[PDB]
Symmetry: C2
Subunit: 164 residues, 2 copies
């Protein structure tokens, strides 16, 4: 199988931060028997993100993204994904319950529970933003936070969804 | 409109596979940012003609300055120049200055095929001297857009990018 990796974040493009997430993702996917075909790095911009998901989906069976998931309005990954697949976001009650725990919540916080119907939320064992696994036809998309420790914990949590 | 937009391309299976981290893309991103560009998209692709061609074409669609590193070197696996030529519709021809540069570096009249091929360039490009390693860089013009094609060895990539800074201002 083929996989593609997406990195969402202006700080990566500007070289403020070395893209360690893409290396961890690529190595994890390669270890599991995937050909990692392409890497896309895009701005926090919902149309740029939508474009990357669309091309990634065309050339692979599995697409993994990191970045653009927090409570900030710079976090546009899920929206970009939803625009790509042509589905509205809905506040998910399961995600909402996850968020509530973490906090004991404003619009920017509530935003983190909004997902397309195509996605299942995966609880974040380290931070706040749930990961997403989505089905787009027979293909799979995994959407991860940008914080390395969260990304790593979540991707390992999702191994059985990855194993070929 | 794409005037202050730049894109970065990294070519190399080992980067995709996460065997090495992409430090070149960080250095290029920071260099371009430092000179007032907006770095719009980053592409990482395999050592593969069609994939390399894809990345350059998309990069050129969204930016007026495109900088690539990787896939320049004395091995058949180093395919970046050829991928670039194919994607702009040009043929490679031996550049005699480039060829002379190379023979001097190797102190040998008789290069292997993989070494000789480092002098093969499309007409839209000029070679840039690599004082550190053996593969020349290339600066190319595609209409009013510019394309800088660099070795993937960080010390060489950084040396050549710095030597090109007056083309970048």
């Amino acid at each position: 199988k083929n996989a593609s990796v997406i990195t969402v974040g202006n700080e990566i493009l500007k070289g403020r931060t070395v893209n360690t997430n893409a290396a961890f993702i690529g190595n994890f996917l390669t270890y599991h028997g995937y050909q990692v075909r392409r890497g896309f790095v895009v701005m926090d911009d919902l149309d740029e993100i939508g474009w990357a998901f669309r091309v990634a989906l065309e050339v692979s069976d599995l697409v993994v993204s990191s970045g653009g998931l927090g409570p900030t309005f710079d976090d546009m990954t899920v929206e970009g994904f939803a625009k790509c697949i042509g589905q509205d976001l809905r506040i998910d009650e399961d995600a909402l319950a996850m968020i509530k725990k973490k906090y004991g919540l404003t619009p920017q916080r509530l935003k983190m529970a909004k997902i397309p119907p195509s996605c299942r939320p995966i609880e974040n064992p380290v931070g706040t933003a749930p990961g997403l696994i989505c089905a787009v036809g027979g293909k799979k998309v995994i959407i991860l936070p940008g914080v390395p420790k969260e990304m790593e914990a979540l991707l390992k949590a999702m191994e059985k969804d990855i194993i070929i």
